[PDB]
Amino acid sequence: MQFSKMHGLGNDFVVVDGVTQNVFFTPETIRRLANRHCGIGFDQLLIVEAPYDPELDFHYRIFNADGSEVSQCGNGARCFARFVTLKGLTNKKDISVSTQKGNMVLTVKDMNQIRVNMGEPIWEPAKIPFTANKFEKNYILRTDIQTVLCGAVSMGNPHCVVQVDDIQTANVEQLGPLLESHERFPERVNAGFMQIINKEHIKLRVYERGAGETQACGSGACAAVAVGIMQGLLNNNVQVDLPGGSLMIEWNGVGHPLYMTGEATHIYDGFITL
Numbered sequence: 001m002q003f004s005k006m007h008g009l010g011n012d013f014v015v016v017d018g019v020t021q022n023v024f025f026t027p028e029t030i031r032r033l034a035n036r037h038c039g040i041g042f043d044q045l046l047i048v049e050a051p052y053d054p055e056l057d058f059h060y061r062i063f064n065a066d067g068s069e070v071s072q073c074g075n076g077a078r079c080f081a082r083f084v085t086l087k088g089l090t091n092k093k094d095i096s097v098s099t100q101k102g103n104m105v106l107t108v109k110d111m112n113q114i115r116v117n118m119g120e121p122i123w124e125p126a127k128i129p130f131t132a133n134k135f136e137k138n139y140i141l142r143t144d145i146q147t148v149l150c151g152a153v154s155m156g157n158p159h160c161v162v163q164v165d166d167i168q169t170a171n172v173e174q175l176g177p178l179l180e181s182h183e184r185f186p187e188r189v190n191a192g193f194m195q196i197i198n199k200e201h202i203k204l205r206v207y208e209r210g211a212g213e214t215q216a217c218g219s220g221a222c223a224a225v226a227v228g229i230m231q232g233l234l235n236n237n238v239q240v241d242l243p244g245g246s247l248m249i250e251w252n253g254v255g256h257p258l259y260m261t262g263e264a265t266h267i268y269d270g271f272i273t274l
Contacts, residue, residue: 002271003040004087006079008264009216010244011043013076015083018047019058027067033272034065040272043215046076048084051098057090058097071100072157072190072208073217078114078264081106086266101156109261113248116260118219121226121251122154130158131184137231143178145171150179151227155258158189158209159223163233167195167203176207192220199234203241216244222258225249 001023003016014033016023025033025045033039044062051059060080064070080097084090085108095106105117125132130152132139138149141160151161160179164170170193179191194204206220207213221240228234229251240247248261 001273002269004083004269005040005042005267006083006264007267008076008079008245008262009218009242009247011075011215012041012267013079014040014042014045015076015079016045016047017083017087017089018049019089023047025063025067030063030067031065034067040270044070044076046080048080048089053098056096056098056103057092058084058095059099059103060097061100069100070211072211073206073214073219074099074104074116074118074155074260075216075218076264077104077106077116077218078262081108081114081116082264082266113261113263116218116262118155118222118258118260120254120257121223123152123230125152128152128154128158128189129186130189131186137227141179141182141184143175143182145174145178148175148179151231152189153223153226155219155222157219158185158187159192159220160185160189161192161194161224161227164193164195167193167205170195170205172205172207172213176213180207180209190217190220190223192217192224194224194228196228196233200237201239201241202228202234205243216242216247218247218260218262221247221249222260225251226258229253 046062049059107115153159176191188209191207206217225238237250250259
């Protein structure tokens with residue numbers, strides 16, 4: 001079985017062409033391959049599978065180094081785009097791929113960058129879901145250690161954004177878990193902590209629900225910029241500085257989809273029996 005190693009936003013992946021290969025991994029296998037000393041070594045592994053829908057071009061499923069089939073933050077979306085074109089699985093500049101959570105449209109820019117369409121951010125409280133009387137630009141959340149102000153959005157997963165004085169000293173370790181599993185969030189939520197530098201530049205740290213703080217969470221970057229733009233604190237087209245890397249977020253208000261631009265680098269190709 002042949003594969004290709006790539007990386008983006010501090011995370012290195014192992015992409016596999018499951019469209020022409022009948023591959024199938026089990027938690028064990030993945031955990032074994034994910035081993036940096038006895039395996040291929042990688043943070044995540046995604047498989048390019050055929051979409052059983054004439055509407056979509058491809059379908060893919062990311063995997064945690066643990067072997068669990070994750071599905072959040074739209075990770076490896078650019079790696080999938082770059083891989084799919086490099087190996088010549090398509091020739092279209094615009095690709096419609098689906099994941100465990102809905103789907104998205106990616107476009108390969110001439111700048112070799114990959115622009116992703118995350119659709120329009122959902123604000124309806126009950127549609128996030130988030131228990132709130134009505135929509136507010138600033139919801140008051142109360143935690144055991146303190147009451148905070150935040151914004152709630154939705155790309156497909158629930159998102160809670162909190163502004164901080166300094167990204168490095170943000171009590172993410174304590175507050176993150178507090179917000180992640182809050183009662184006002186029926187299905188938990190992704191707690192994002194962002195620090196505003198300019199009206200077009202912000203630093204952020206996300207605490208993925210059921211996972212915790214990771215290298216980078218695409219979705220989190222989108223949500224952060226959304227509330228920022230809705231709050232009128234950020235301009236359209238904002239750069240997001242995540243621990244793993246940077247991202248170019250674009251959005252022109254309600255009635256417009258939210259675009260997320262980033263890049264993926266191909267390192268090498270490999271072959272492994274079984």
